């Protein structure tokens, strides 16, 4: 009847909606779609970080370790955000309420592979009927469990994973008695999130060096 204190804490710390806010003047193109996600990501990171501080244990850790966990899991937390927001949609990705990418828009932005992979995460959590309580706790664990090769206090990070894990296993014990294995089912989705994140981080660096981006902005500049 009463919830877990950490889960409850995590729910109040859950940041408000952030808007993509595409430029209506810029004509639809690959670069727009990218440009629009980049600036979204960057504002989301700022709140994601603000959010991190509210996770119990986190702020007690050294500034280097806090840095190192965020440095490893940022893209998993971003990606897991769109996935949740996407749950009650079909073949569309809600990057923001004003920015939903269906297949066609993804074909235009060259994120067809990338988003298909993200839809794979959406399909699975759809099956389980992922619940907010679970999303926010999973975000926390993705962070804690981020496998940075550069941790100072290994025992403290483990202790952070153990606390958050325990909150999941407790929520899932009280709210899902019909599935004694729901927590593990939830944890068994982590690897796809990891795989997918790395894909994303790849794609992104892969198109800086394939620097189409500033070329586009320069065409529009001359042409308009």
């Amino acid at each position: 009847k009463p919830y877990n204190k950490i889960v409850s804490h995590l729910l109040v710390a859950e940041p408000e909606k952030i808007y993509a806010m595409p430029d209506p003047t810029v004509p639809d193109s690959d670069i727009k779609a990218l440009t629009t996600l980049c600036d979204l990501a960057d504002r989301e990171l700022v709140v994601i970080i603000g959010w991190a501080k509210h996770i119990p244990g986190f702020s007690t850790l050294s500034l280097a370790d806090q840095m190192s966990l965020l440095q490893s899991a940022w893209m998993e937390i971003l990606i897991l955000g769109v996935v949740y927001r996407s749950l009650s949609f079909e073949d569309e990705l809600v990057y923001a309420d004003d920015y939903i990418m269906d297949e066609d828009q993804s074909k235009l932005a060259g994120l067809l592979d990338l988003n298909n992979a993200i839809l794979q995460l959406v399909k699975k959590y759809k099956s389980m009927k992922l619940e907010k309580e679970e999303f926010v706790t999973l975000k926390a664990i993705a962070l804690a469990n981020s496998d940075s090769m550069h941790i100072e206090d290994v025992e403290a990070v483990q202790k952070l994973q153990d606390v958050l894990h325990e909150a999941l296993q407790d929520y899932e014990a009280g709210q899902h008695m019909e599935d004694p294995r729901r927590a593990g089912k939830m944890l068994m989705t982590l690897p796809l999130l990891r795989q997918t994140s790395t894909k994303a981080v790849q794609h992104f660096y892969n198109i800086k060096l394939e620097g189409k981006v500033p070329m586009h902005k320069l065409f529009l500049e001359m042409l308009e």
Binding site: V46, I49, M67
Partner: peptide
């Protein structure tokens, strides 16, 4: 930046 954002955002 990423490094810059994380850093700036933790700092203050």
């Amino acid at each position: 930046g990423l490094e810059a954002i994380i850093r700036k955002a933790l700092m203050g």
